[PDB]
C-alpha cells in the first residue's frame, strides 16, 4: 500500500490541518499540541501506529496503575490482536498497534483508526 | 508442526508426569490450584493461553500495580515479546503467540511452557 497517500487522504477527510504531517521510508509523523506524536509506518508488510510517552516514575505508575490497566484491557477492534499494546523501554512507555489489512485501503476508514488510537493516547496522557 | 508430539516430548524432557495432558485440538495441561495451560495451532502459529476468573473490580484496583508490572515484563519467545491480557465477561485471559524459532524443538519448547507457567503463577498470586 501507499501509506503517505492513505494518511493524507485520512486527514483531509476529517478536516485536520495539513501542517501536522511530517515525512522515502519509515516513518510518517503527526504532531499534536501538548502530546506525543503519532508515528505511522509499514513495518514488515503491516501498517503500525505508535506513540512514545516519557516513562513515568515508578511511584506515578503505581498510583495510575488501575486506570492504565483499564485502558490496556479495552478492546481495539482494528488491531491484529484486538488490543493496544504497551511496551516499556528504559526511556519510554510505548503504545503500539498493528492494523489489520482490511482497514488500510480506505482513507475514510483509516481516519477512524487514527482517531480511536489518539483517544487511547489521550487517556494514557491523562494519568501520566 | 506436530504439536502433540512437541508437547509430549517437552514434558518428558523436564520429568513432568504424563497424567496432566489431554486433547486436532486444543490440548490442555492441568496443574493444581491453577488454570490449565491451553495450547493449539491457530492459523499456523502455536498459541498458549490460560483463563482466570474475572476479578471483581475492587480486587483489580488493589492488584493493578502488580498486574501492570507483570504485563510490562518482556516475554522473548512471543512474536510481539509480550504476554497479552484479554478481558471477556467471564475471564481475564493470559495469551501468547509463540514465534517459529521456538516450536521445532521439545527441549526449547519446555522452557517456553515453564516461563509461561511462571507468568500464570504471578497473576494467580494477586487474584
Ligand atoms: S485534526 C488532529 C487530529 C488528528 C487525529 C490523530 C486524526 N485526531 O484524533 C485529531 C482529530 C486530534
Ligand atoms: S511438571 C509440571 C509442570 C509443567 C510445566 C507447565 C511445564 N511447568 O512449568 C511445570 C514444571 C510446573
Amino acid at each position: 500500500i501507499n501509506l503517505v497517500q492513505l494518511v493524507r487522504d485520512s486527514l483531509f477527510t476529517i478536516g485536520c490541518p495539513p501542517s501536522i504531517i511530517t515525512d522515502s521510508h519509515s516513518a510518517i509523523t503527526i504532531s499534536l499540541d501538548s502530546m506525543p506524536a503519532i508515528n505511522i509506518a509499514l513495518v514488515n508488510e503491516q501498517v503500525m501506529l505508535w506513540a512514545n510517552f516519557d516513562a513515568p516514575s515508578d511511584v506515578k505508575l503505581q498510583s495510575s496503575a488501575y486506570n492504565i490497566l483499564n485502558l490496556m484491557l479495552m478492546n481495539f477492534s482494528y488491531s491484529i490482536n484486538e488490543l493496544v499494546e504497551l511496551h516499556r523501554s528504559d526511556e519510554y512507555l510505548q503504545l503500539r498497534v498493528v492494523i489489520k489489512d482490511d482497514y488500510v485501503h480506505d482513507g475514510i476508514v483509516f481516519a477512524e483508526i487514527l482517531h480511536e488510537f489518539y483517544q487511547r493516547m489521550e487517556i494514557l496522557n491523562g494519568v501520566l
Side-chain angles (χ1 to χ4, degrees), chain A residues 45-58:
Chain A
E45 310 300 293
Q46 300 177 297
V47 167
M48 190 180 294
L49 306 176
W50 74 98
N52 298 144
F53 285 85
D54 300 342
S57 79
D58 199 335

Side-chain angles (χ1 to χ4, degrees), chain A residues 13-100:
Chain A
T13 297
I14 59 164
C16 276
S19 58
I20 62 181
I21 302 160
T22 55
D23 181 41
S24 191
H25 311 278
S26 328
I28 309 295
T29 307
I30 295 176
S31 300
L32 303 163
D33 277 17
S34 302
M35 279 287 287
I38 301 183
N39 306 289
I40 313 166
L42 281 183
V43 171
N44 199 25
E45 310 300 293
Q46 300 177 297
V47 167
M48 190 180 294
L49 306 176
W50 74 98
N52 298 144
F53 285 85
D54 300 342
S57 79
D58 199 335
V59 164
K60 180 54 145 192
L61 192 69
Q62 170 156 25
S63 56
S64 287
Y66 180 65
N67 294 325
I68 292 166
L69 188 50
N70 284 333
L71 172 69
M72 298 315 145
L73 292 167
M74 295 197 300
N75 274 344
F76 191 87
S77 56
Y78 313 110
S79 189
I80 61 176
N81 59 2
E82 217 182 10
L83 287 170
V84 187
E85 291 163 29
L86 191 61
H87 290 75
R88 192 179 47 200
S89 52
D90 288 3
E91 160 167 331
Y92 296 142
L93 277 193
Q94 190 185 70
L95 279 188
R96 186 189 298 189
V97 68
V98 180
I99 305 308
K100 292 192 217 154

